[PDB]
Design a protein around this ligand. Structure first.
Ligand code: CL
Ligand code: CL
Ligand code: CL
Ligand code: CL
Ligand code: CL
Ligand code: CL
Ligand code: NA
Length: 129
């Protein structure tokens, strides 16, 4: 599923991401934009052999199981395919664990490089929330 900007903002808010661990909704929408272009089916292979999955490009090295990432973990206790669903519940729940891991949203390199410090409120501007 390819979400609209405000549609994703609304879904993220309903699932409790607005100000989760202090990160306003615009941060999450901005991260999703540059990670996946709002596409739940996005996948991308990493140099180390792991793969990133879903709207927030969650990786198989630590967070989900895809059966092909040696020496990895599955700390969110989910198959990585669950992260590609039109239902973003699994992605959100896993994202909550990741952002609580210690480095906050810096876990998402694209958030650090393209969202952090910017006017992220722009990403939810005009949205009925
Ligand atoms: Cl957009
Ligand atoms: Cl915001
Ligand atoms: Cl594996
Ligand atoms: Cl599994
Ligand atoms: Cl949803
Ligand atoms: Cl933080
Ligand atoms: Na894994």
């Amino acid at each position: 599923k390819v979400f609209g900007r405000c549609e994703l903002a609304a879904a993220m808010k309903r699932h409790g991401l607005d100000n989760y661990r202090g990160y306003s909704l615009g941060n999450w929408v901005c991260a999703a934009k540059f990670e996946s272009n709002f596409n739940t089916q996005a996948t991308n292979r990493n140099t180390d052999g792991s793969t990133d999955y879903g709207i927030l490009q969650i990786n198989s090295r630590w967070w989900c199981n895809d059966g092909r990432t040696p020496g990895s973990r599955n700390l969110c206790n989910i198959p990585c395919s669950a992260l590609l669903s039109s239902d973003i519940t699994a992605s959100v729940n896993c994202a909550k664990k990741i952002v609580s891991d210690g480095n906050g949203m810096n876990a998402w390199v694209a958030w650090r490089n393209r969202c952090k410090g910017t006017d992220v409120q722009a990403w939810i501007r005009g949205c009925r929330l």
